[PDB]
Structure formats: structure tokens, C-alpha cells
Amino acid sequence: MYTTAQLLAANEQKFKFDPLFLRLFFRESYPFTTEKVYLSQIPGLVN
Amino acid sequence: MYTTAQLLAANEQKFKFDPLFLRLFFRESYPFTTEKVYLSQIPGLVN
């Protein structure tokens, strides 16, 4: 009621988080205008 | 049915090969005009 507290700076408590993956390997990115996607992997073995 | 399914990748992962012998030892080419091919040598040995 008459304490008259004084506030100092409070902490922030950050989170240790660095992707390395959404910045290293996944450089490419695309949208989907369709319901699904297709992936092609054609092996080449000539005789 | 309703399978629009846009594709985005066509990875091959086909083969791993490089001669390097074509440049290592046989730099010079000599296509034939005739059919018979003659090559010889000279041995060096003396008492």
C-alpha cells in the first residue's frame, strides 16, 4: 500500500535455436497450387 | 481422379564416371585412312 517498489531490468530468457537446415540444405523452396506434388528419380545405367 | 500434382524435381543420380586416361597417356589421335596398321620398335643391346 505504501511499499513504493522500484523495478529494475528483467530478464528475457532466450531460446537456443539455430536451424542450419532451413539455411544450409533447403535453399530451394516452392509453392503448391495443386493438391499434391510429384518427385522424379530416374536412374541412369547404360551398358 | 483430382490429382493435379505439380512436379518440382527430376533428380537423376545416374552415374559416376570420368575416364581421365584419355588425357593421362593417349593425348594424340590418329584415325586410319587404310586398314592395315603398322607399328614397330628398335631394341638397344650390345656386347
UniProtKB/Swiss-Prot annotation, chains A, B:
Signal peptide: none annotated. It is found in: Virion; Host cytoplasm. Transmembrane segments: none annotated. Belongs to the lambda phage major capsid protein family. Homomultimer. Interacts with FI protein. Assembles to form an icosahedral capsid with a T=7 symmetry. The icosahedral capsid is about 60 nm in diameter and composed of 415 major capsid proteins. The assembly is primed by the interaction between capsid assembly protease and portal dodecamer, and major capsid proteins assemble cooperatively to form the procapsid with the help of capsid scaffolding protein. Major capsid protein forms hexons and pentons of the icosahedron. Viral genomic DNA is packaged into the procapsid through the portal vertex. This is Major capsid protein. It comes from Escherichia phage lambda (Bacteriophage lambda). The lineage of its organism: Viruses, Duplodnaviria, Heunggongvirae, Uroviricota, Caudoviricetes.
